[PDB]
Amino acid sequence: GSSGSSGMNGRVDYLVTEEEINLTRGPSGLGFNIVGGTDQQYVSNDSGIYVSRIKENGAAALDGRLQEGDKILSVNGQDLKNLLHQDAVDLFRNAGYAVSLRVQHRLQVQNGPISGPSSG
């Protein structure tokens, strides 16, 4: 049994870390927009929930922790999958004073040397 990638040619090396962002519910809910939903799948290869934009004077801003481009894996221990855009928004509300959002930080690693002095 053989197997191959069969994908686009290019380097995709990035370190992913799992972190839990615990924010407080504002006067209404939160201060940041999200993108998700099997129908609104921010991407064709992704259907989870991500962050499109974050308020300047919102909880997501003050806390600092939460940052745009984050993929909220689960909320308060509730995996976010096979759900619609409305399904994700709702859960965010049910959360309550304490909203736990487990996001994954994935940044492209600088794969390559650097022009400088003798590297120790």
Task: Report whether 72 contacts 91 (CB < 8 A).
Answer: no
- Report the CATH number at residue 53: 2.30.42.10
Closest of 69, 75, 103 to residue 89, by C-alpha: 75
User: What total of structural domains would you count in the chain?
Assistant: 1
Q: Which domain holds residue 115?
A: 1-120
- Pairwise CA distance, residues 74 & 40, whole Å: 18
Indicate the DSSP class of residue 77. T
Task: Report whether 28 contacts 58 (CB < 8 A).
Answer: no
3-class secondary-structure state, position 13: coil
Closest of 30, 52, 54 to residue 43, by C-alpha: 52
Beta bridge mates, 105? 17
Q: How far are the Cα atoms of 20, 49, 64, 92, 113 from residue 56, in angstroms, in the given order? A: 21, 20, 10, 19, 37
Q: How far are the Cα atoms of 13, 48, 100, 111, 116 from residue 119, in angstroms, in the given order? A: 22, 41, 42, 16, 8
Written as one string, the DSSP assignment of 17-71 is EEEEEEEE--SSS-SEEEE--TTT-SSSS--SEEEEEE-SSSHHHHS--S-TT-E
Q: Quick one: tokens of 61?
A: 């801003």
Technique behind this structure?
NMR
